[PDB]
Design a protein around this ligand. Structure first.
Ligand code: AGS
Ligand code: ZN
Lengths: 1117, 72, 57
């Protein structure tokens, strides 16, 4: 409007707020809002202080709360924004809160008067109010936010989620003011109509956080609040909203099912949900299993999706036959990431080949074992058997596959006492063998047991290579592993019969030949064109050569997804190795074939000026398989000689440098053989050092295919290539190579190879430091790092800082795994490397750790917990993880049993109050049981563990994987009960008297405080309120009893029409501010619905309030 | 959710009624001291609710002589 | 999982409500810098009451 900014601040701000008051006449709203902008700029550049502003805070509050009452939305938004910049400490907020400005803020929230910019500043102001001091938040804005978020979805309000977010932010710092007005019920009923997964889990996390700490656990009821979310499943006819559109009744039901499913699978990822849902009483998990045993084919088919998504198992296809849904849960099934464009061989080898770690704890197995034991304890297997027998076929197939997956998980991640009597299945075998029941139940039980045996055979088969490159890689690795440590003749007759029936020599028409017979002639042992010199065999191999050459354009033109596409490629590979099987007679065909191959590849790569572009022919036809021939030419020692007789390796070396085609480098890097030293490793090193960044990343990622497949002598060159890749310019390639090295150092022969070529892993992030800490696990390398002053430098660093950062690391990994947090299918949550775990291994750093006396303060911290704040809980988590990593070997239990701290952790795992550390203790006791002595110690305290490693799939019942579980799972589910925080005249006259006949103060709870006007007459010297025009006192109590009766929501129409007739007959009874303050105080203490609350707040809209304005202008000037 | 109620399963409503399978009680409404008594053998595990303002159920017991006794 | 300390829970709430809201409002409301139908009813009842009261009861 007219800013100067160079004057006396007292004169300026006095004319500023005087023009804000404006005497309710002769001042426009535009100059007032520009003045409010000038005021907030002046408060921005000059700091708020009562001496340099020239006025007390109170007058600024009185002349800023008048800006909320003007009819223009812009001046109201400007007043709210200027009030937000004033609240900076607790005293200003207390002075703002003493006179009832919160009534005006709660008024400006709930009007929805086409203002989405004016309601944003109010929410920002109350977020600032929660931020400054949340223990002084008023009940007015709390009731306003609860009324908006409780009945906002039906009224199409667009501020619903923005209000529920503020309610959830308020419930973390001041839970009593939210639980008193019923905000937790609003949160809990708002997770059942929210299809968005992240918002649903963010809403359920606050409810599960109040149930964690006892001081907040006193604000939640026992079995009626949290168990509401499994009410769409337990109640067959569930009606969430009382008044909804009857046209949408099925889509609403599916929305309730989806939101309740997301809430159920989001409470089972938190420890406060696992413990509170599996309590030993009449819990909420037994009501979930009990409704599964009831033949209702709508709830029963929907609970199986929840059971499939809890245990992280893949869903089968919806069919009626077991053999079709068994094929869809095959772990080696084709996926869209395995295509050549996205993830050709490396992403497939990640899935089908197993991880190199056989003794890492893998905390996902700990969590799944705890969940499976808690579900089996409440009788899930009997319910699954009852669903298998007495149901439809569509549900019986899905329940049979679920029972097969659970029975396979039982003999893998559960301890022996938990899982030695599960595979008998008494309730199903006694039904399959009883000839007294009707025969249908017996036969379907026998069919179910046959399908379970078939699923067990499918599980013990394993994943198979879908592709033909990875198949050749695994076959070559198995062949060299067999070859490192150590049939019929059919001379001329049967060979001639087989080549006669093969139909190759009869007619030259392709796709009509008998390719099984061709494969049998080419793969028979002693026919190799070197001992059987017959002209018919030469004709046969010449016809096959002319078919397989790309220049003839016969094999290179058939497209992908062909009927017989893999068979022709397999026959081609065994044919081009059969040609090499005669090394002195098989040159004239093999040289011609490889010359035609390199001619085609030079023509298609871009080494010619004709087109230099044939990516549309390689990517969709079988002509991309000509690398595989080079692959099966590259394994044999006589193969590399023949391959170098032609210009093949130099051709790939020139292919490495180009920039336009990235698929050809993917094809040649996954086909060649790197078993022996030669020119094949030079091409791999050239792709790894100087190529396109995407091809460089894929070549760095293709070392898992050479690591997990157990290619021999990997520690010689693969470690060298990884160390060379660590110095790359790109960051993702270096981080990926760091991850490959962190996986590869799980073998001692690879860690010894890495230590012998000392790298620089300190200039990278925390992953490089965690990889370098693995050097301490063996004496050769610990003794190397100890001389340069590194272990003593890391000891105090991990003592002061990195003990409480390791817990952040493992919690971040678990949250990224199974809570969908994403800090800015089942994964493998492998345990990070702890220095205390590496020092103990070799008995020298064990003594180096013992002389520092770090275990004593750790046991003192575990024995003396505070359990009140949130920093000491973090310190206790750090100490528990440190003790669990110390007790991971035999040299750690020796110095850990001298203080006797294992019973302390065992008692903390079942008698603690906070449940997050009660789960942390379970993980730590699992990590303790990685040795035989640890499991023997835990057995005396009635805690079983798994005694097998991850080496064999089926180990004979008599280093380990870290997993320990109590013998009775209900021991850690005991919670000591906390009582709820609640257990600790004219109304009779108006029934028989009408309003007109009684026509021929009324404020009940009105005092000096809690009034909009009467608070100021004492502190700031406001003049007392005037005498208004017994004629008005009765209308006051009449409108008060009407707005009281409007709270029950029984018959709202009569009361609103009565209020409308009162406003029509007497438009001046809604002008006294001492009545508006009373009805605002009544709104601040009752449960009004949102349209009723909006109507009540809008009744007092077109009011003047002249007297407070003029006396504020009088008290100012 | 009251017009939606049209059938009742005994596993969901009252699980002690369908697990009887034999009783010493007589079938209600039929007992005379000059005749051999009919004992309650079984109870059907599904009831059908009649669409009315009071919703009367349709219980059907099964006596020891192989005859069904339908009640309301 | 471990979502128990109030800082991670607050960060999860803010990023979940900001990123996954179709309607705008939240990314304006959750900025981390600070870290008339009754009028229609009354006018209708006014015009109805004007014509209504014309007889003796
Ligand atoms: N689709 C085909 N498949 C195999 N051979 C083909 C095909 N089309 C044409 N031919 C010809 O057949 C030749 C190979 O046949 P040979 O090994 O010479 O046996 P052959 O019976 O002596 O053949 P000809 O035609 O009688 S001399 C190929 O090099 C082409 O000349
Ligand atoms: Zn007053």
């Amino acid at each position: 409007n007219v800013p100067l900014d160079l004057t006396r601040e007292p004169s300026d701000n006095l004319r500023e707020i005087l023009q804000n008051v404006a005497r309710l006449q002769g001042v426009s709203n535009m100059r007032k809002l520009g003045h409010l902008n000038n005021f907030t700029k002046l408060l921005c550049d000059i700091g708020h202080s009562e001496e340099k502003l020239g006025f007390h805070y109170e007058d600024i509050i009185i002349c800023l709360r008048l800006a909320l009452l003007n009819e223009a939305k812009e001046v109201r938004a400007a007043g709210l924004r200027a009030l937000r910049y004033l609240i900076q400490d607790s005293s200003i907020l207390q002075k703002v809160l003493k006179l009832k400005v919160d009534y005006l803020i709660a008024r400006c929230i709930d009007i929805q008067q086409s203002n989405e910019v004016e309601r944003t500043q109010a929410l920002r102001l109350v977020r600032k109010m929660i931020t400054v001091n949340a223990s002084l938040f008023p009940s007015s804005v709390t009731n306003s936010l609860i009324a908006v978020g409780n009945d906002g979805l039906q009224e199409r309000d667009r501020m619903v989620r923005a209000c529920i977010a503020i309610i959830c932010e308020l419930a973390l710092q001041n839970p009593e003011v939210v639980a008193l007005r019923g905000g937790l019920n609003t949160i809990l009923k708002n997770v059942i109509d929210c299809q968005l997964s992240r918002i649903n889990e963010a809403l359920i996390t606050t409810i599960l956080h109040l149930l964690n700490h006892p001081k907040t656990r006193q604000y939640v009821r026992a079995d009626v609040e949290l168990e509401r979310i499994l009410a769409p499943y337990t109640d067959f006819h569930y009606r969430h909203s009382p008044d909804t559109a009857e046209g949408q009744l099925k889509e609403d039901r599916e929305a309730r099912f989806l939101a309740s499913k997301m809430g159920i699978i989001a409470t089972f990822r938190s420890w406060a949900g696992i413990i509170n849902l599996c309590k030993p009483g009449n819990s909420g998990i037994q009501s979930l299993i009990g409704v599964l045993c009831i033949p209702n084919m709508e709830i029963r088919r929907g609970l199986l999706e929840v059971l499939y998504d809890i245990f992280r198992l893949p869903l089968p296809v919806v069919t009626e036959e077991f053999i079709e849904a068994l094929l869809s849960v095959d772990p080696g099934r084709f996926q869209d990431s395995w295509r050549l464009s996205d993830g050709f061989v490396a992403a497939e080898a990640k899935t089908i080949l197993p991880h190199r770690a056989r003794s890492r704890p893998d905390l996902m197995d700990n969590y799944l074992a705890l969940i499976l034991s808690a579900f089996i304890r409440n009788g899930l297997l009997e319910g699954l058997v009852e669903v298998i027998t007495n149901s439809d076929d569509h549900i019986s197939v899905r329940a049979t596959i679920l029972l097969g997956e659970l029975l396979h998980m039982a003999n893998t991640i559960l301890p022996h006492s938990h899982s030695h009597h599960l595979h008998c299945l008494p309730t199903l075998m006694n039904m399959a063998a009883s000839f007294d029941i009707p025969k249908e139940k017996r036969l379907r039980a026998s069919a179910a047991l046959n399908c379970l045996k078939r699923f067990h055979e499918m599980k013990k088969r394993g994943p198979k290579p879908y592709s033909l490159h990875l198949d050749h890689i695994i076959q070559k690795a198995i062949a060299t592993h067999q070859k490192r440590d150590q049939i019929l003749k059919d001379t001329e007759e049967a060979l001639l019969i087989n080549l006669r029936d093969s139909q190759v020599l009869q007619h030259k028409e392709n796709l009509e030949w008998n390719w099984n017979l061709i494969g049998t002639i080419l793969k028979w042992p002693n026919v190799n064109l070197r001992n059987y010199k017959d002209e018919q065999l030469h004709r046969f191999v010449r016809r096959l050569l002319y078919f397989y050459k790309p220049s003839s354009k016969l094999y290179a033109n058939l497209d992908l997804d062909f009927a017989k596409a893999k068979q022709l490629t397999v026959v081609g590979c065994q044919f081009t190795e059969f040609l090499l099987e005669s090394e002195e007679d098989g040159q004239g065909y093999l040289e011609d074939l490889v010359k035609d191959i390199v001619q085609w590849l030079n023509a298609s790569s871009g080494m010619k000026p004709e087109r230099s572009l044939q990516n549309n022919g390689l990517l969709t036809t079988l002509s991309q398989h000509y690398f595989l021939f080079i692959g099966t030419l590259s394994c044999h020692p006589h193969g590399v000689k023949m391959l170098e007789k032609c210009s093949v390796f130099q051709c790939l070396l020139n292919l490495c440098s180009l920039k336009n085609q990235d698929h050809l480098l993917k094809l040649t890097v996954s086909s060649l053989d790197y078993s022996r030293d030669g020119l094949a490793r030079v091409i791999l090193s050239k792709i790894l050092t100087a190529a396109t960044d995407a091809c460089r990343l894929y070549a760095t990622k293709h070392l898992r295919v050479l690591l997990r497949a157990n290619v021999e002598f990997f520690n010689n060159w693969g470690i060298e290539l990884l160390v060379t890749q660590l110095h790359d310019k790109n960051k993702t390639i270096s981080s990926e190579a760091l991850d490959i090295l962190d996986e590869a150092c799980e073998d001692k022969a690879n860690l010894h190879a890495l230590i012998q070529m000392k790298p620089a892993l300190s200039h990278l992030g925390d992953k490089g430091l965690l990889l370098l800490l693995r050097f301490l696990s063996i004496p050769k390398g610990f003794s190397y790092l100890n001389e340069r002053g590194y272990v003593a430098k890391q000891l105090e660093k991990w003592h002061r800082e990195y003990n409480s950062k390791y817990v952040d690391l493992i919690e971040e990994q678990l949250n990224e795994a199974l809570t969908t947090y994403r800090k800015p299918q089942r994964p493998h949550v492998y345990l990070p490397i702890h220095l205390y775990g590496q020092l103990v291994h070799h008995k020298t750093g064990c003594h180096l750790l013992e002389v520092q006396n770090i275990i004593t303060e750790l046991c003192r911290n575990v024995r003396t917990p505070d359990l009140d704040k949130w920093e000491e809980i973090k310190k206790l988590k750090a100490s528990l993880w440190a003790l669990g990593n110390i007790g991971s070997s035999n040299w750690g239990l020796n110095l850990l049993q001298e203080e006797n701290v294992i019973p302390d952790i065992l008692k903390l795992a079942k008698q603690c109050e906070v449940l997050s550390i009660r789960g942390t203790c379970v993980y730590v006791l699992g990590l303790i049981a990685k040795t035989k002595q640890g499991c023997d110690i835990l057995k005396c305290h009635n805690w079983d563990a798994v005694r097998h490693s991850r080496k064999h799939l089926w180990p004979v019942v008599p280093d380990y994987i870290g997993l320990a579980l109590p013998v009775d799972i209900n021991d850690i589910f005991q919670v000591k009960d906390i009582p709820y925080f609640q257990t600790k005249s004219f109304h009779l006259l108006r029934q028989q008297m009408s309003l007109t006949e009684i026509m021929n103060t009324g404020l009940q709870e009105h005092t000096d405080d809690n009034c909009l006007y009467c608070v100021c007459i004492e502190i700031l010297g406001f003049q007392p309120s005037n005498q208004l025009s017994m004629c008005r006192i009765l209308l006051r109590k009449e409108v008060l009893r009407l707005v009281i009766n409007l709270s029950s929501s029984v018959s709202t129409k009569c009361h609103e029409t009565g209020l409308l007739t009162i406003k029509e007959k007497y438009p001046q009874t809604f002008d006294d501010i001492c009545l508006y303050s009373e009805v605002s105080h009544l709104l601040s203490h009752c449960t009004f619905r949102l349209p009723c609350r909006r109507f009540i707040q809008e009744l007092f809209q077109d009011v003047q309030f002249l007297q407070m304005h003029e006396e504020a202008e009088a008290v100012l000037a | 959710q009251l017009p939606q109620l049209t059938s009742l399963e005994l596993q969901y409503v009252s699980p002690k009624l369908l697990m009887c399978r034999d009783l010493e009680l007589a079938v209600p409404g039929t007992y005379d001291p000059n005749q051999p008594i009919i004992r309650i053998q079984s109870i059907a595990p599904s009831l059908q609710v009649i669409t009315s303002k009071q919703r009367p159920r349709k219980l059907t017991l099964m006596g020891s002589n192989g005859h069904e006794f339908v009640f309301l | 999982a471990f979502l128990d300390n109030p800082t991670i829970i607050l960060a999860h709430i803010r990023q979940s409500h900001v990123t996954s809201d179709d309607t705008g409002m939240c990314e304006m409301v959750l900025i981390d810098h600070d870290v008339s139908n009754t009028a229609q009813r009354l006018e209708r009842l006014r015009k109805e009451r004007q014509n209504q009261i014309k007889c003796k009861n």
